[model samples]
Target: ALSLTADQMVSALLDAEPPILYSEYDPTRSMMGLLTNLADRELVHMINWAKRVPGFVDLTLHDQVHLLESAWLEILMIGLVWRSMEHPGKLLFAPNLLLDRNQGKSGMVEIFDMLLATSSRFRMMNLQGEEFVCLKSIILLNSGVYTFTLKSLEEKDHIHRVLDKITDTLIHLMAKAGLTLQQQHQRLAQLLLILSHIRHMSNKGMEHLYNVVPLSDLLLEMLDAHRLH
Candidate 1:
């Protein structure tokens, strides 16, 4: 039963009924386009998956939107890493916004350094894809941004309930992979710590953007889900 539900959550993220593929990805000859295509699609699947959580349906639509907005960048950067090659240093930012380690120091260096470090730690922990799907949803549920937006104790409890269920599944996954009790404990802590690294990286990443033109235009306009229908 535990395993069955865990697999269902993972399938929604990676293997929906029709299966969501990057079939329509529009990268340039240089690579990168359909600017928000991947980003939006990523959020869409996550939100859809989150909706399946036991108490998520209890939140008001406004609360849902606010929480999701706060959670998006964290999810985006993580998704960015997942979409990249197995190693940490070179990040394929967008299909177009590649951040190769060999490249010169530009505004991105600060954030790039953090990604490499974050990816390194994640790799060292030997985390699995199912863990990330669970972690991503957990991050969304326990979003620190909720510190203010969510005023009701009831609301907070429900969110934490959902978080605990997924986290228990993550521990189950770790055990299935042959981790003993202590190893599973440390691995869980390490996985949550990576989100802290991304929190700071997200700030720097946003800071470096808008200094560029097209990327700014894309975010403020094309990728603005708030303004999107």
Candidate 2:
């Protein structure tokens, strides 16, 4: 007989149908017992899968969103567990290991450096405004779905709208680079703000900011032209 633990129950259900399993015993009584036990167990497992999988940083974007809607309850449970773990002085030794400040700083700096390199690469490639927009959409979409905590539905919708705008801009720019010059300029202005923010963050020891800044600047220059109206 399988243990009553949620994981064990889930494993059993996935491995064998309840009716089939019950047939080994008294067909009628076993079938009823197996179903009742399995229904609640299945719910528990589904929830667990949802919460643990999404935003894991390993899965692709689509899988993250699918888990969010399908396994909401499990996700909620995992969040509660995390919060409990985070409560002050809840577990001294565990906290010390998990929140080592020196290690955190080192990791942050490494991330920032990587971001800086990526930005540089983008600049060298001369990616246009529409390309950047597409990239931003992918990033935001992944963030929204995996994080499952958008400020509002409007924010989510805005990302989708921006994606469309990017597509339109890409089409318009493809005919002649000069025709899209104004749009390029506007995009460069936006990139400047992004890079500025990255620089500030890096200065303050938020190394991750380093990742985005340099590329942003490069994009800015690509869009800039000295032609007068």
Candidate 3:
């Protein structure tokens, strides 16, 4: 069976994540350039992390690529939001490339505000580690399902099944943590709502950075895919 316990899946996710990144801010480097540099690094980590998700490889190569391409921005945004949950007003773009609400210039100010708002939601939700990983896994499996309908129906059904299993695992973990059934269902509903916000900001992110940053070719390719969605 192409399955793993939630504990093992959580461990795999943690292992795949890059260690906290740090970059020194220098006057010589453009802020956008520095920020995108950090994003470039994170993009690499995100791809590696996706591949390690249990049963991800079971999808055909085309579906795998299409899903990652379509959802890359949302995946990145969620991680950024999760990382900044403690700091409320600032985005930990990386450990060192922090963007405060008043610090971003031009269009970035708006993007920063949206990021801060979403990060605040994460904070208020008290998003836990296992919850975050399972949430991310769901996002990956579910992204582009509506937008890309040319995919094989069988594999598409497979994706939904995978999502159901992961979500069950998440709810099971919540139960173990002592949340009443009502509380667990309530939290899951809130999380689903948060994902819609993430999707909105993800499209905004694609537009805001599309031509602004000197993105790596792979990053550019992924961004283009999201644009089509």
Candidate 4:
């Protein structure tokens, strides 16, 4: 019955500080020990509690897909931020992916890819089901699906052009859904802010890297729309 919202979770993760250091000790070791003993236990407990929440089994297929997408984004965001804080040199924008050569962390890349695939599948379903226009518009606006690397000014311009194309498609879709221009602009602003925050944290400044499939705002909107009913 925990009334946790997606926005709250995002804020908590974004506000988290880098691992602390203790005198004459390896901060990584200390951080790992603390994380293992306290954070890990709490995380497991929370996972169980989340599954037991009311309405757990009553959600529609769309709602369930939306929830999974939100969880996926949260995981990816937290992992990226954690890695950025822990190791900056090895983390770089690899056009379509975040490349980190560090061992023991390769698993995270796999997890992100898995999440992306799930989001894509869910999105395809949403497109074919009811509320297709709304869901599709949200996807187009939020996910940087067509965007690629930006190694130079020409590449940056090309990426922006791609974004503009996607934006036009999203606008057309939203129009079909009767969504106002003001509302669309608001959603776009929110998407930009999230992208800006992540870019600020990452090494390549969001120029080359594209987000994982589901946009965080899209996920929040899905949660709110479902909860209100």
Clash number for every model? Answer: 1, 7, 0, 0
Query: Model 3's lDDT to the true fold?
Result: 0.77
RMSD of 2: 24.6
Question: How do the residues 1-229 of candidate 3 rate in per-residue lDDT, one tens digit apiece?
Answer: 1377767766776676655666656638577877777776777777667777777777866677778877888988888889999987998887667778877854657767888999898898788988888888888888776655455887888888888878777888789899999998888899988888888888888897664543344644543343344
Clashes of 2: 7
Point out where model 4 deviates above 4 Å: 1-75, 78-153, 200-229
Worst window of 10 by summed lDDT in candidate 2: 16-25
Strongest candidate by lDDT: 3
lDDT of 4 by residue, 12-129 (tens): 2234322322123333653224323433333333333323323332443344344444333333343333333323333311112334434324213443343333334334333322
All candidates' TM-scores?
A: 0.71, 0.25, 0.85, 0.26
The order of the candidates by lDDT, greatest first, is: 3, 1, 4, 2
Query: Considering every candidate listed, which one attains the maximal TM-score?
Result: 3
lDDT, each prediction: 0.62, 0.35, 0.77, 0.36
Give the C-alpha miss distance for residue 121 in model 1, angstroms: 1.9
lDDT of 4: 0.36
